[PDB]
Amino acid sequence: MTARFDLFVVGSGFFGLTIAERVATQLDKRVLVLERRPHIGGNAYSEAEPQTGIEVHKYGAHLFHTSNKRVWDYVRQFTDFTDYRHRVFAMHNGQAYQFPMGLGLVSQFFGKYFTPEQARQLIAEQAAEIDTADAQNLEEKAISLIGRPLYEAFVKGYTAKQWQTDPKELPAANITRLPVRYTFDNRYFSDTYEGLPTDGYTAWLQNMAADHRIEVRLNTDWFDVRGQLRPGSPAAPVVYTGPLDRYFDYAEGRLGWRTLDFEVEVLPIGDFQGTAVMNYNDLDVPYTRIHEFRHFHPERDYRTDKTVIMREYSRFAEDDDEPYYPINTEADRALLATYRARAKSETASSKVLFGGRLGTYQYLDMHMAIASALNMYDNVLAPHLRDGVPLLQ
Amino acid sequence: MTARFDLFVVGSGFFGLTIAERVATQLDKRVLVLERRPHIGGNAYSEAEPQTGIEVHKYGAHLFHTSNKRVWDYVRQFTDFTDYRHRVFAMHNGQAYQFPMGLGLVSQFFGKYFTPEQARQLIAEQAAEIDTADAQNLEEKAISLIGRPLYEAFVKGYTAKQWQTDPKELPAANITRLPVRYTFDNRYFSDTYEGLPTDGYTAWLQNMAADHRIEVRLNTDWFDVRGQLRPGSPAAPVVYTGPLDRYFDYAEGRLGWRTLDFEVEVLPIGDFQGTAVMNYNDLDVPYTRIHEFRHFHPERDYRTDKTVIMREYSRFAEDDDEPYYPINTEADRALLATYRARAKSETASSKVLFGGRLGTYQYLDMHMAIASALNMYDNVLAPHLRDGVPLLQ
Numbered sequence: 001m002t003a004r005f006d007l008f009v010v011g012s013g014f015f016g017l018t019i020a021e022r023v024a025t026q027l028d029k030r031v032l033v034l035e036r037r038p039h040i041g042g043n044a045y046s047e048a049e050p051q052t053g054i055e056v057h058k059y060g061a062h063l064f065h066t067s068n069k070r071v072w073d074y075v076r077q078f079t080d081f082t083d084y085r086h087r088v089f090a091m092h093n094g095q096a097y098q099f100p101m102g103l104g105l106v107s108q109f110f111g112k113y114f115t116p117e118q119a120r121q122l123i124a125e126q127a128a129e130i131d132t133a134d135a136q137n138l139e140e141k142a143i144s145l146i147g148r149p150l151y152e153a154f155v156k157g158y159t160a161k162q163w164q165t166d167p168k169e170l171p172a173a174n175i176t177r178l179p180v181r182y183t184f185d186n187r188y189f190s191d192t193y194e195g196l197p198t199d200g201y202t203a204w205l206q207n208m209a210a211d212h213r214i215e216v217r218l219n220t221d222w223f224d225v226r227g228q229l230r231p232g233s234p235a236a237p238v239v240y241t242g243p244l245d246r247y248f249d250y251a252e253g254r255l256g257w258r259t260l261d262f263e264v265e266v267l268p269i270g271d272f273q274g275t276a277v278m279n280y281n282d283l284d285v286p287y288t289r290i291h292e293f294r295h296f297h298p299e300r301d302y303r304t305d306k307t308v309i310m311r312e313y314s315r316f317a318e319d320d321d322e323p324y325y326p327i328n329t330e331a332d333r334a335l336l337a338t339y340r341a342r343a344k345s346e347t348a349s350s351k352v353l354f355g356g357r358l359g360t361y362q363y364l365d366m367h368m369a370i371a372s373a374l375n376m377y378d379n380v381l382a383p384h385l386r387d388g389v390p391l392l393q
Numbered sequence: 394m395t396a397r398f399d400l401f402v403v404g405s406g407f408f409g410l411t412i413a414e415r416v417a418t419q420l421d422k423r424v425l426v427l428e429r430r431p432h433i434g435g436n437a438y439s440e441a442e443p444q445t446g447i448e449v450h451k452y453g454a455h456l457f458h459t460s461n462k463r464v465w466d467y468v469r470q471f472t473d474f475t476d477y478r479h480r481v482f483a484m485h486n487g488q489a490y491q492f493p494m495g496l497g498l499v500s501q502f503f504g505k506y507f508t509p510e511q512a513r514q515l516i517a518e519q520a521a522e523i524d525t526a527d528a529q530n531l532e533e534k535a536i537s538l539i540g541r542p543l544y545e546a547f548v549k550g551y552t553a554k555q556w557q558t559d560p561k562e563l564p565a566a567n568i569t570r571l572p573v574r575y576t577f578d579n580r581y582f583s584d585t586y587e588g589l590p591t592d593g594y595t596a597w598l599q600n601m602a603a604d605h606r607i608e609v610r611l612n613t614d615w616f617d618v619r620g621q622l623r624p625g626s627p628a629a630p631v632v633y634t635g636p637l638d639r640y641f642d643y644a645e646g647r648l649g650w651r652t653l654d655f656e657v658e659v660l661p662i663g664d665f666q667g668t669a670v671m672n673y674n675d676l677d678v679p680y681t682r683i684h685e686f687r688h689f690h691p692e693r694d695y696r697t698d699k700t701v702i703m704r705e706y707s708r709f710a711e712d713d714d715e716p717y718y719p720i721n722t723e724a725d726r727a728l729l730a731t732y733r734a735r736a737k738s739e740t741a742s743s744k745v746l747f748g749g750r751l752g753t754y755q756y757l758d759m760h761m762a763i764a765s766a767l768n769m770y771d772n773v774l775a776p777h778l779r780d781g782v783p784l785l786q
């Protein structure tokens with residue numbers, strides 16, 4: 001007589017699974033998760049290459065990092081973490097540079113050693129065109145942090161291949177993802193906690209969706225089955241984590257997305273580049289970076305006669321393409337505001353919530369996605385499924 | 394009527410304290426430790442600089458590292474460890490290079506990026522003068538590993554200032570302390586476990602000598618009091634960890650030692666070199682390296698208007714100088730063999746054991762010293778103090 005499920009979740013990414021796991025274990029409710037991909041985990045899905053055994057991140061490399069202790073403690077319930085610290089090198093004019101901004105990069109590019117004090121002065125001179133506080137876009141913000149000469153050499157070219165958009169049109173928050181230091185610290189991230197899942201990403205994601213009150217239906221599009229499912233559970237809300245503009249059939253227009261293509265190759269050598277990730281900042285090369293996955297897990301002993309590499313290509317996401325990056329131009333932010341209104345309306349009429357990287361058109365990382373899911377649970381979903389509180393304020 | 398103590402230990406270094414702690418806690422025996430320095434811990438003694446609060450390693454920088462899990466588990470009984478990974482940079486011709494041997498150093502010194510495969514070929518050509526298996530001394534071993542061009546630039550000069558001895562006379566084991574890689578890994582050590590004592594070295598050493606059955610007498614030379622002490626405990630053995638040649642009053646001759654002088658300076662700036670340790674490989678500079686101790690503990694937030702640095706100078710250890718490094722030339726190894734005979738004799742006549750860096754004329758690290766102390770306890774001291782087994786085989 002009663003309801004089949006207590007909640008619908010669309011997408012088995014870190015946002016969806018976090019939501020599904022909290023509702024199931026803490027509130028003791030049945031959750032149905034719908035994934036149209038052949039597997040779970042979203043873009044965090046990993047897979048072992050048959051010849052080498054090396055774990056391959058299928059949808060781009062994934063490195064976990066956070067400063068939120070609550071998030072850190074939460075994710076450790078489902079997996080252990082290695083003490084791996086992510087470092088990136090940059091390729092420019094046939095030379096590998098230390099990266100990102102630091103005394104290593106400065107002394108290499110400018111030919112001599114600069115003291116921390118001397119380095120600050122050098123950059124201050126080259127960044128005299130614009131102040132950081134008055135930075136509107138990516139180009140201005142980048143120059144105000146690392147100076148114009150370094151901007152032309154390591155930022156302008158890479159940004160061209162990655163976004164294919166005028167640097168003066170891109171958000172400043174994009175370049176502020178990279179730490180700016182005046183030491184020899186070349187850690188690509190600056191968070192308290194950092195590491196890779198010891199037994200791989202897939203094992204991690206399978207532990208979150210392991211509860212018996214969580215059912216996951218793979219190869220299932222929500223728009224194909226929502227007509228039949230929701231009548232079975234009329235009171236059950238829906239957490240949507242797919243493309244926001246797709247949900248409304250692009251009625252207001254199409255948001256700018258960037259998508260990625262990957263070339264995976266097994267090489268008959270033991271080491272290709274001697275590091276995990278190598279950025280290619282020059283335009284004489286079509287790909288943005290190359291991953292060598294064996295350097296992600298040095299604690300594991302892989303064969304030394306073969307190796308797996310992955311080249312990364314960037315282009316505009318079209319009709320049926322899976323979106324990866326929100327471009328977020330001024331025109332995009334305008335269109336986004338319209339969809340947020342339509343989304344706010346859908347929440348009041350049919351109990352449909354919007355979250356995640358794709359569902360909010362946000363440049364989110366794994367830990368930001370999980371934290372966002374925890375906040376949605378604590379403030380919105382839990383008071384509703386437990387105390388009858390409406391979804392809207 | 395009975396004996397005052399069950400064991401005498403000379404020197405409060407890591408060897409002595411490890412011995413004293415094991416005997417006291419496991420065998421329930423009274424141990425007297427004699428230290429002629431004003432404090433305990435030997436050269437591992439740390440001290441907070443008053444103006445900045447920064448922990449200063451008084452007798453040279455100390456970084457703990459090991460692959461022995463038994464040692465690792467043992468030391469964690471007395472202290473916690475940070476996740477600090479030691480990295481060294483090299484200064485050559487006004488330029489800071491990545492260090493030690495790796496793709497970073499190669500691509501910097503030779504001006505362009507070398508693949509792991511290309512790098513192996515380049516070094517193989519430059520190391521064609523001598524094979525590594527047939528390496529007798531430091532100079533030959535160094536060339537056979539990193540090639541002659543890199544040897545002249547980063548090894549030959551540094552070795553000159555540090556040892557003031559012909560590179561063909563020094564042991565090959567000296568240069569094999571540094572890892573030789575063909576990746577971008579610039580970790581100065583290659584051990585499984587590594588870190589710094591969270592609450593400092595002195596707190597660590599005080600926890601080992603904390604047991605009530607261990608008495609430590611500071612400012613006391615063993616040669617001044619052994620005439621009065623040993624009659625009080627005739628059955629008690631003695632573990633000597635001081636200079637081996639000094640114990641026999643240099644009767645057979647003087648072993649070659651290197652000693653160190655330090656210049657500690659508080660600077661009115663927040664950062665001097667942006668890294669923990671900077672090697673100076675050129676001869677136009679008197680000191681071998683510079684330490685900036687604030688980069689040893691990034692987890693602590695020190696003031697940013699002042700900093701503490703320490704320059705390190707090397708010279709021959711004379712009469713009353715405290716020895717730091719055994720030179721171990723062919724002449725030294727000959728003289729050493731003589732003292733080992735005299736030492737083997739002293740063990741049989743007056744129950745005097747010899748151990749530690751100074752007591753064995755060995756280039757030992759902290760973990761090698763502790764492991765050595767554990768082996769002496771398990772095989773020699775424990776069967777004697779508990780089962781009456783003689784000290785000699």
Ligand SMILES: Cc1cc2nc3c(=O)[nH]c(=O)nc-3n(C[C@H](O)[C@H](O)[C@H](O)COP(=O)(O)OP(=O)(O)OC[C@H]3O[C@@H](n4cnc5c(N)ncnc54)[C@H](O)[C@@H]3O)c2cc1C
Pocket residue numbers: 010011012013014015016034035036037041042043044059060061062063064065220221222223241242243260324325355356357358364365366367369
């Ligand atoms: C190349 C790349 C590298 C990254 N590296 C890092 C990193 O190193 N560290 C870090 O912290 N973050 C990294 N991220 C970011 C991170 O992957 C995201 O935070 C993460 O994907 C968050 O999950 P999400 O569920 O909000 O989005 P997604 O996990 O992509 O979840 C969305 C899922 O919804 C499903 N779906 C969509 N529409 C439907 C539908 N109609 N019906 C059914 N299912 C649907 C899709 O199958 C998709 O799998 C990286 C991202 C990319 C693209």
Ligand SMILES: Cc1cc2nc3c(=O)[nH]c(=O)nc-3n(C[C@H](O)[C@H](O)[C@H](O)COP(=O)(O)OP(=O)(O)OC[C@H]3O[C@@H](n4cnc5c(N)ncnc54)[C@H](O)[C@@H]3O)c2cc1C
Pocket residue numbers: 403404405406407408409427428429430434435436437452453454455456457458613614615616634635636653717718748749750751757758759760762
């Ligand atoms: C500059 C430097 C840097 C180093 N860095 C590292 C590092 O980063 N990581 C690492 O693992 N190892 C490092 N080491 C090595 C490490 O310090 C030694 O392993 C360590 O000192 C071992 O202790 P030990 O007791 O065998 O020698 P010591 O600790 O020097 O102990 C000897 C003690 O005996 C006492 N003594 C001597 N004679 C008498 C006497 N007649 N009467 C009373 N007392 C006496 C002395 O006071 C002395 O303190 C470094 C060494 C040096 C010199």
Ligand SMILES: O=c1ccn([C@@H]2O[C@H](COP(=O)(O)OP(=O)(O)O)[C@@H](O)[C@H]2O)c(=O)[nH]1
Pocket residue numbers: 090154155156158159162174175177178279281
């Ligand atoms: O070598 C680089 C790396 C970063 N970026 C810029 O910084 C942004 C964020 O870089 P990040 O590596 O964080 O992007 P992601 O890992 O998500 O692909 C990119 O979009 C680029 O615009 C750059 O210009 N040069």
Ligand SMILES: O=c1ccn([C@@H]2O[C@H](COP(=O)(O)OP(=O)(O)O)[C@@H](O)[C@H]2O)c(=O)[nH]1
Pocket residue numbers: 483547548549551552555567568570571672674
């Ligand atoms: O930049 C360097 C560092 C090391 N060495 C040689 O390698 C030996 C050991 O170096 P290490 O840093 O381990 O010595 P320590 O830290 O004990 O002073 C030194 O004696 C030198 O002969 C060198 O030639 N160049």
